[PDB]
């Protein structure tokens, strides 16, 4: 295996292979953020789909000017 | 444990059928009415934590519809028009009062409301529902506190039913707690 300056510079970034946090770790936080992302995607989809009409959000070409 | 006769073993007076097994003398105010065995899979510590907080909101909510049809504070009258109790949860969200009663309550629950359940779930010493608030020590006297713990929960178990009733009765007919007692008939049906 060749050793290089860039290889030694970036070596700690590729050093902790297989290192894991115990148990579930931050899984509830990930699930909560995924739920927020799903709600956001639903909001933007229904805005584009015109099933959700917020005020001052005219989904139309005529809104360009 | 205020008295075994009021709560705990031998005080299961539903035709006993033994006693919901998880339920036992230890939990406060247990007569063993657990038809659906909720205790069976559940963490009665979240279960006990969950009942007292629903009870405390309701006794406070209930004192409220009753002391609201009977009183309105300096002002209120000019704003809020003069409105029945659900309308307030629709006008208030806009006068802004409520939204600044969800800010501070959210601040309350996040900072102290959520760690305390995790500690009770974690095996921390605090009993489900103990926030250690006893500014005047009615609690201090050990004997009376045991009576209060059975008292607190029973009134809360009563209030949650009453406040649920007050809200159910008013939408169908009448206005508020005091007036619904006031007009017995389905004679006038003021709209919500």
């Amino acid at each position: 295996a060749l050793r290089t300056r860039l290889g030694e510079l970036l070596r700690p970034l590729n050093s902790e292979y297989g290192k894991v946090a115990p148990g579930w770790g931050t899984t509830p936080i990930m699930g909560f953020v995924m739920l927020l992302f799903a709600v956001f995607l639903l909001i933007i989809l229904q805005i584009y789909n015109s099933s959700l009409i917020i005020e001052n959000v005219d989904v139309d070409w005529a809104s360009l000017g | 444990y205020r008295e075994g006769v009021l709560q705990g073993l031998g005080t299961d007076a539903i035709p006993g059928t033994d006693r919901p097994k998880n339920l036992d003398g230890a939990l406060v105010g247990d007569v063993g009415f657990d038809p659906l065995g909720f205790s069976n899979w559940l963490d009665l510590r979240w279960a006990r934590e969950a009942e007292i907080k629903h009870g405390r909101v309701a006794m406070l909510a209930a004192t409220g519809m009753i002391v609201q049809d009977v009183y309105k504070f300096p002002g209120v009258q000019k704003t809020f028009g003069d409105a029945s109790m659900m309308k307030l949860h629709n006008v208030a969200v806009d006068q802004g009062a409520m939204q600044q009663l969800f800010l501070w309550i959210t601040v309350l629950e996040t900072l102290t409301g959520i760690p305390a359940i995790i500690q009770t779930l974690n095996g921390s010493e605090r009993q489900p529902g103990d926030f250690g608030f006893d500014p005047l020590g009615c609690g201090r006297n050990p004997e009376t506190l045991a009576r209060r713990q059975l008292v607190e929960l029973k009134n809360g178990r009563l209030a949650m039913i009453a406040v649920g009733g007050m809200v159910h009765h008013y939408l169908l007919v009448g206005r508020g707690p005091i007036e619904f007692v006031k007009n017995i008939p389905n004679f006038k049906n003021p709209l919500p």
Partner: protein
């Protein structure tokens, strides 16, 4: 808040309280019981 936004939020609440909460309650209640 358009009537459309109100329908959206209540749709989120109903999905939570009619689909997610009842089904999830049942799985925890029967999983723990068996």
């Amino acid at each position: 808040m358009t009537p459309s936004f109100s329908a959206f939020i209540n749709s989120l609440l109903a999905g939570l309280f009619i689909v997610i909460i009842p089904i999830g309650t049942a799985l925890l209640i029967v999983s723990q019981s068996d």
